[PDB]
From a paper:
Carbonic anhydrase IV (Car4) is a newly identified receptor that allows [name] (AAV) [name] to cross the blood-brain barrier and achieve efficient infection in the central nervous system (CNS) in mouse models. Among the generated AAV9 variants with higher efficiency for infecting the CNS, the variant AAV9P31, which includes an additional sequence (WPTSYDA) inserted between Q588 and A589 of the wt AAV9 VP3 VR-VIII, exhibited efficient CNS tropism with 385-fold higher EGFP expression in the mouse CNS and 1000-fold higher EGFP expression in the mouse spinal cord compared to wt AAV9. Car4 is localized on the luminal surface of brain endothelial cells throughout the cortex and cerebellum, and its sequence and structure are conserved in Mus musculus and Homo sapiens. Here we report the cryo-EM structures of AAV9P31 and its complex with Mus musculus Car4 at atomic resolution by utilizing the block-based reconstruction (BBR) method.
The structure of AAV9P31 was determined by cryo-EM with a final resolution of 1.76 Å at a 0.143 cutoff of Fourier shell correlation (FSC), and the side chains of VP3 capsomers were generally well defined. AAV9P31 has an additional seven inserted residues (WPTSYDA) between AAV9 VP3 Q588 and D589, which are numbered 588a to 588g. The main chain of the inserted peptide W588a-A588g is well defined in the density map. The inserted peptide in the AAV9P31 VR-VIII loop is very important for receptor binding.
Residue numbers in the entry:
A (entry chain A): 219 to 588, 588A, 588B, 588C, 588D, 588E, 588F, 588G, ...
B (entry chain A): 429 to 481
C (entry chain A): 482 to 588, 588A, 588B, 588C, 588D, 588E, 588F, 588G, ...
D (entry chain A): 219 to 271
E (entry chain A): 587 to 588, 588A, 588B, 588C, 588D, 588E, 588F, 588G, ...
F (entry chain A): 219 to 428
G (entry chain A): 632 to 684
The structure:
């Protein structure tokens, strides 16, 4: 408080240490009044008659929340380049959050002209759901995060949640949460808020690509001591059955015995960026490859981590198996392909199956020769495996993270799960960073001079602004490779252009021209 | 009290896109590629981190 | 878990009169390259009472002393069999089981809608909760160890 | 007083113990000026002619 | 789409998944217990098992 | 803060010692909003078609900077006369910088009439590039210095910089700097800023004729 | 030595940067992801003191 004194400082930089990097980000926010200080029941019926697949029931709250669950909220593009070009892995360790320099403004709109003035006695309520007693919405890749550019001023998003629904109706098991049922303190002028949190133990993210394929792990000079069936008939035919075996064999690497097999798969439809190569029909929902839950079909959005395309064809992408980001200024309804940025997980093709291909073939009958009678005899038949679950001896790589991608997600509190790495990429934790809720305290207008028991519905128009600072410490996994030839590194292009990539244009608009992965260095196996 | 396919915020869009149109309609050579944001009105096609058992 | 393999009989007259070593091999693909599903998941080599059958590429095959390297006869090689694990692992040359593939329904308004219960064969089954299995046996002539590939994830390496 | 400082906090919850429960409630109130700062004598005659009851 | 020749062109087709094994990122709940139901069971002594 | 209390004092004079002279200057400044809080790419093409000799590429920032890299910013004309008439040489040794008495005003322009009011809760961000990680523009003899006359009120100049260019275009080697990527603190009401610096060893200036 | 005269140093007096912190105007009551481009018109004034030995 006061002209000569502040309640907070700059705090925007990145410190690089031996095996640690500390990122600090500071932004200025604006928080309006949401829902006119009311809790409102919402459902699909309130927005027209939709399909059963899109039915929902929930509540909208007058609270707002802070979101920094994206990598660009903490790493500058140059800092991201340092991270991915020199480290085999990384993971968050602890975070520090600060709220300071609160300013509450009141707005009067009389006879057209609008006037904004300070309201020194107003308050802003902040609390953290450190016990995870509220629905968690930070793991759904929603907008409203801290802007990647530090100079941008952003709007705090409104907090809402969903519960159980039967169509547009609710059931007795549905839960209603009031955020005012959490501790409320009395504040004076000039206060600040801060808290700390420690990330639970998570595995390092694989920020590397494999220099070896799963089917090429053998010595290309030495035979195996195992045999494979190589011939079933002598050729010609009447009764020419036989059994011949052979050694494999660098010349027959396909039939060699192996200890491990590629990870699981779930077939996705293949779409070409060359529109003339696609079928002349409307297939976005019909060929979507989805999953069902309680009679509702939900798109198999990215899903299991699978290679986006086969080698030598980057023009193909799975229908809903890849993260698709929008370019700066891109609209929201029916935009062209040049307005969106489609990621591809081509690095994991060494261990994961191709998203648009079958996992393999399996036998579907018993081949048999003649034996008594004739029609009984049948040749060997095989069938395509379009979806394959986990099998012992399987290995796979998880989906890559991106500069514009999410960081963490909350593992659902269930009896069981398998490999709870979030399917959109990142670190899955049972106790992620808690949600931080914020709201302007309502200030009623002049009440009537005669008592009335009805709740007040006339408030002073107010909004608040301030600064938010988040600092995260990351642990680094160094690389000690013995590779002789130079590695692949992310780099800018020297060729001249009208604008500098990852900068502002003439109008002052910051833009990220392309997605940045983390898998540039290489390692064996 | 929550379903696996309804864990998102019903008020905020995602920063991910999904393929929404493959043809302009009519036909002879009408192939195209259109993408859209999902989207509380299109919860079915939203990207998700976990899948049913 | 299981992954169907073609069944081959040591009695050559019982096999089909056709060349099937690659065509009926049951392989997996990686980056457009097909690789044989050599032994793969540990599965029982054959059903009880028939040791003359072996999976096409589901068993370790050793060569006898002095055996050549190209197109040798069956008597020159030694085919192992994992018959001990038939108490917990599925038979390599059989389907894992059957699953329902439709909704049986009675008459109800109209007639053609009614349909009897139908089932389909499960040729490959992934890991499910509550599954138990035995790993492949080791042999005097077999390998001892192997290096787990350095990847983000693996199951039962 | 002051923007950066408050004079009170959240304090709205319930704590359940073995044989005790502690409830805390916080509300925002509004107080107008009543009776124009005057004390006024009131009676039934000021609101018409009612019954003796 | 079309590309050289005509019969090669084919529309997108999908198949039903009647049985699905464990995949990474899967979550599930175990079967409920009952007042009349069993309490425990012995895990078979085998080399491997999943979620016993 | 407050009517009865200040956050800074007069401090405008010169002290002459045996082999040292200490000069102190105090001025009042005004800092507007630059570039509407935006970073803008600038080039010669934005100002018409010039010659190759005048082509450039750079960025304009919403920041301002303090300039006192002129001798009249520290020496009065009489003090300059004392220096040059009695000494064979001189050189700077150390400097002290202070910022205080911050006042932030907000302007409303409705239906013609303009009103200016105090905004007590607003902040001003200050930092020093003590690691020389930004382009240095104080050595180009630019305007915007502290006025020689102490009574004058001056406008703080806007900070901009240039990078590599090929005509009006940029190259991959060009650098873009964001000044918000430097440490940012939270401030209360009535604060001040100050820092010290020591001049590195430099030879005496030859204030003589042969 | 600078050609325009004076003292040339590898580490001269550092640049001092100053800026008014942006104060946004009233934001809309419905969330919008675009960066705010409506701010209160502000300017600042004060005193600066520099002493050199």
């Amino acid at each position: 408080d006061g002209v000569g004194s502040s309640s907070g400082n700059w705090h925007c930089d990145s410190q690089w240490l031996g095996d640690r990097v500390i990122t600090t980000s500071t932004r200025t926010w604006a928080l309006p009044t949401y829902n006119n200080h009311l809790y409102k029941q919402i459902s699909n019926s309130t927005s027209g008659g939709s399909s059963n697949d899109n039915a929902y029931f929930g509540y909208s709250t007058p609270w707002g929340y802070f979101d920094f669950n994206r990598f660009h909220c903490h790493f500058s593009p140059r800092d991201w380049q340092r991270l991915i070009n020199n480290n085999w892995g990384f993971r968050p360790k602890r975070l520090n959050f600060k709220l300071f320099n609160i300013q509450v403004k009141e707005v009067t709109d009389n006879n057209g002209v609008k006037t904004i003035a300070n309201n020194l006695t107003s308050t802003v309520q902040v609390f953290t759901d450190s016990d995870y007693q509220l629905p968690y919405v930070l793991g759904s890749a929603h907008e409203g995060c801290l802007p990647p550019f530090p100079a941008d001023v952003f709007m705090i998003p409104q907090y809402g949640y969903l519960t159980l629904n039967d169509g547009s109706q609710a059931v007795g098991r549905s839960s209603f949460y009031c955020l005012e049922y959490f501790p409320s303190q009395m504040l004076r002028t000039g206060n600040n808020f801060q808290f700390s949190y420690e990330f639970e133990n998570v595995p390092f993210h694989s920020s590397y690509a494999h220099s070896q394929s799963l089917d090429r792990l053998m010595n290309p000079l030495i035979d195996q001591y195992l045999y494979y069936l190589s011939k079933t008939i002598n050729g010609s035919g009447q009764n020419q059955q036989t059994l011949k075996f052979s050694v494999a064999g660098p010349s027959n690497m396909a039939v060699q015995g192996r200890n491990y097999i590629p990870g699981p798969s779930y077939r996705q439809q293949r779409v070409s960026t060359t529109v003339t190569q696609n079928n002349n029909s409307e297939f976005a929902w019909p060929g979507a490859s989805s999953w069902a839950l309680n009679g509702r079909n939900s798109l198999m959005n990215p899903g299991p981590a699978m290679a986006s395309h086969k080698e030598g064809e980057d023009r193909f992408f799975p229908l809903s198996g890849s993260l698709i980001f929008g370019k700066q200024g891109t609209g929201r309804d029916n935009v062209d392909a040049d307005k969106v940025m489609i990621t591809n997980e081509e690095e994991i093709k060494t261990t994961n199956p191709v998203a648009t291909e079958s996992y393999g073939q399996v036998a579907t009958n018993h081949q048999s020769a003649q034996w008594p009678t004739s029609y009984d005899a049948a040749q060997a038949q095989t069938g395509w495996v379009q979806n394959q679950g986990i099998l012992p001896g399987m290995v796979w790589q998880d989906r890559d993270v991106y500069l514009q991608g999410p960081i963490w997600a909350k593992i659902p509190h269930t009896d069981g799960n398998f490999h709870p790495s979030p399917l959109m990429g990142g670190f899955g934790m049972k106790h992620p960073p808690p949600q931080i809720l914020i709201k302007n305290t309502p200030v009623p207008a002049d009440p009537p001079t005669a008592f009335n028991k009805d709740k007040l519905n006339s408030f002073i128009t107010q909004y608040s602004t301030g600064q938010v600072s988040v600092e995260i410490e990351w642990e680094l996994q160094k690389e000690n490779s013995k590779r002789w030839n130079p590695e692949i590194q992310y780099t800018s292009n020297y060729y001249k252009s009208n604008n500098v990539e990852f900068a502002v244009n003439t109008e002052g608009v910051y833009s990220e021209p392309r997605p940045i992965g983390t898998r540039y260095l290489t390692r064996n196996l």
